[PDB]
Design a protein around this ligand. Sequence first.
Ligand SMILES: CC(C)(COP(=O)(O)OP(=O)(O)OC[C@H]1O[C@@H](n2cnc3c(N)ncnc32)[C@H](O)[C@@H]1OP(=O)(O)O)[C@@H](O)C(=O)NCCC(=O)NCCS
Ligand SMILES: O=C(/C=C/c1ccc(O)cc1)O[C@@H]1CC(C(=O)O)=C[C@@H](O)[C@H]1O
Length: 435
Amino acid sequence: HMKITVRGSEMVYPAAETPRRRLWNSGPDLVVPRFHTPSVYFFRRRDGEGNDLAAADGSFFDGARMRRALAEALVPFYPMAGRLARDEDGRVEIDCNAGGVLFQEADAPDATVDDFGDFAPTMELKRLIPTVEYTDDISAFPLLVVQVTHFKCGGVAIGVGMQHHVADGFSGLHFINSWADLCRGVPFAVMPYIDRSLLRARDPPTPVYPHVEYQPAPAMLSTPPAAVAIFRLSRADLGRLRSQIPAREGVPRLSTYAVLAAHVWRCASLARGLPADQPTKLYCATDGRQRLQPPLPEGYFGNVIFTATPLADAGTVTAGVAEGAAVIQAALDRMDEGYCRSALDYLELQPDLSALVRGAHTFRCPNLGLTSWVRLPIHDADFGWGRPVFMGPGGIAYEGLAFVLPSANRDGSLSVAISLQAEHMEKFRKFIYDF
Ligand SMILES: CC(C)(COP(=O)(O)OP(=O)(O)OC[C@H]1O[C@@H](n2cnc3c(N)ncnc32)[C@H](O)[C@@H]1OP(=O)(O)O)[C@@H](O)C(=O)NCCC(=O)NCCS
Ligand SMILES: O=C(/C=C/c1ccc(O)cc1)O[C@@H]1CC(C(=O)O)=C[C@@H](O)[C@H]1O
């Protein structure tokens, strides 16, 4: 257990006038998981070639500079400085009240960036993000909490906790990367678009699918300690996995996500010892920006996550990657404009969206969640002292939940960070390379 000492904490507020208003949240904003999404950045003090990355003025993640840029970033991104609240009907919304965000600095005088190893999202990493106390008062806590930790090596971590109602990964990183840009002294490219009514349902709502993704996950037909780990597959490993799927003249090419996801689903199902007739459901967060037509404004600030949920008997998934990948890709291919549009209507008709919130019961054995960050700009946060050498989830709250990460370098590898029951992880560790 690492010695981390927090220097002290500050609420940081927008540095100019911002609108005082209630901000309506869309259906997709309300069914993402509860609490604050964790992510952690690591930065080394030297670049690969060994030069010090401190700036000409000697600075290296100077807190004052970072806080000034943060306060500037919270002007156009002002809902990030707000608080949760409810409207008259009890629907959660964002109270844009300039309550501010938490920023704190810490020192870990004994540890180095090297000490974190593969950067698996264990509790070791979670300690790099401020802790939030949740009570029944949902207005009580900041929507954004940040910690900057300084290490013995001269390295730094930035831990980010971002309340999920405010933004999905694309919008959340749009904020962090804009903050980084300001800190670095460059204007940022894209102003956020703040109005979420663009994702309002049609009137009357007219859903035209069952929306399997919002139905209860399968239970076992028939508390445990939960382990967390990270596994890299090289570009060569990924190619060999793909080459195991027959290429036939009729049949269109499966996505890499579908191939890798099928492999993870297969390995997890085997590790868990699922019987062939056990239904299993895989939850795949899908970015609706790439699917809605016409597309949303470029800087649209919110969640645009729709959910693809391949569902099959475990015997199908474990029979082989090819069979699983076909099922996943079909589920992904369903998520077009017509489908995503229908989903908005379907959510509008629900008496209570809190019931659909994805959580532990969603992802746990026999089911799985596999969220890709591969196309997210997770490595673009250069505050003026270099790009991060790693970025990933700061923890995994739920057994059965996993992340696909792109490499921080150019080598074309992918990493899978995953939480499973401890006994199952011991098998999964072996199985993920057993092909
Ligand atoms: C399938 C999906 C659900 C997840 O997959 P993904 O890992 O993010 O990546 P995608 O399927 O979108 O595209 C990656 C592909 O485009 C390739 N690619 C790389 N650069 C590219 C570029 N300029 N242009 C086009 N394709 C490119 C990639 O190599 C890859 O090709 P492949 O599948 O044949 O290997 C996708 O639809 C998606 O939603 N991505 C965003 C995920 C997200 O936001 N998750 C949650 C954050 S809250
Ligand atoms: O992946 C994200 C959020 C990413 C993100 C990254 C960096 C940020 O700054 C903010 C958010 O949301 C995921 C969405 C999700 C779901 O069921 O919809 C389940 C989890 O996998 C979340 O972690």
